[PDB]
Homo-oligomer: A and B are copies of this chain.
């Protein structure tokens, strides 16, 4: 039986597009571009540092990815500027139905498992006023790996004392859905982009940037095990757990 619902953070509970106005200031006219490449490179760097055996926490990864992104535009921001702007990732707006979802999921154990560094996750959760909606906010930092490395998911039992079989893992990120399934969790994927809409979008003449991010990041990955469940939004999870049991 499901005893805990563990949430991915970035892209699942929190909207990574919401750094929009901060990036638009870093380079007027190019906010959309920066938003997308920043997120993409942030993910790539977490995978590559881990795979290379050169871990650095998500705060370093986030700043390195921002530096790369602004670099493509010909900028050369200093550490002070980078540390300042990267704070936008600790202010991400929660999806509008997150709070209600989490409230209805009580008394089940509720937690976050995220690539985010400890201080990042605490600030992000605090800013969103969701601190008391979680029994635990788990960072991969203790294991010095990033998802989808199995050690990241091993943390859930260590912290919550529930077995993988008793966990419903929730994520909008295909690679995270894959890593959680690989580890042994039941998984509910949050799919906000209908496949059919993307397909037609990619056929409608010139292809835009956000569309590029969407094509690369909003689908199930072909190498991964399929999620047990797919829902359109977080608010659907309470109903899923009920009609599930």
* A49 at the binding interface (Cβ < 8 Å): yes
* A168 at the binding interface (Cβ < 8 Å): no
- Given A54-B182, A198-B72, A212-B212, CB of A45 within 8 Å of CB of B221: yes
Q: Is the CB of B202 within 8 A of A73?
A: yes
Q: Which of A3-57 contact B (CB under 8 A)?
A: 29-30, 33, 37, 40-41, 44-45, 47-54, 56
* A216 at the binding interface (Cβ < 8 Å): yes
Copies of this protein chain in the complex: 2
* A199 at the binding interface (Cβ < 8 Å): yes
Q: Is the CB of A68 within 8 A of B207?
A: no
Q: Is the CB of B53 within 8 A of A150?
A: yes
Q: Point out the residues of chain B lying under 8 angstroms from A223, CB to CB.
A: 45, 48-49, 54, 56, 60-61, 64
A60 to B223, CA, bound (A): 9
Q: Is the CB of A149 within 8 A of B199?
A: no
Count, chain A residues at interface, CB 8 A:
54
* A71 at the binding interface (Cβ < 8 Å): yes
**Contact residue among B56, B72, B208 (Cβ-Cβ distance under 8 Å from A202):** B72
* A65 at the binding interface (Cβ < 8 Å): yes
Q: Which of A211-234 contact B (CB under 8 A)?
A: 212, 215-216, 219, 221-224
- Given A30-B203, A195-B74, A199-B72, CB of A48 within 8 Å of CB of B175: yes
A114 to B212, CA, bound (A): 27
- Given A47-B51, A148-B52, A216-B37, CB of A65 within 8 Å of CB of B202: no
Q: Is the CB of A199 within 8 A of B74?
A: yes
A40 to B150, CA, bound (A): 23
Q: Point out the residues of chain B lying under 8 angstroms from A175, CB to CB.
A: 44, 48
- Given A37-B215, A196-B74, A212-B212, CB of A222 within 8 Å of CB of B68: yes
Apart from A37-B216, A44-B44, A45-B222, list 16 A-B contacts with CB within 8 A.
Answer: A44-B47, A47-B48, A48-B148, A49-B223, A50-B51, A51-B148, A52-B178, A54-B223, A61-B223, A68-B219, A72-B219, A74-B195, A74-B196, A74-B199, A74-B200, A207-B209
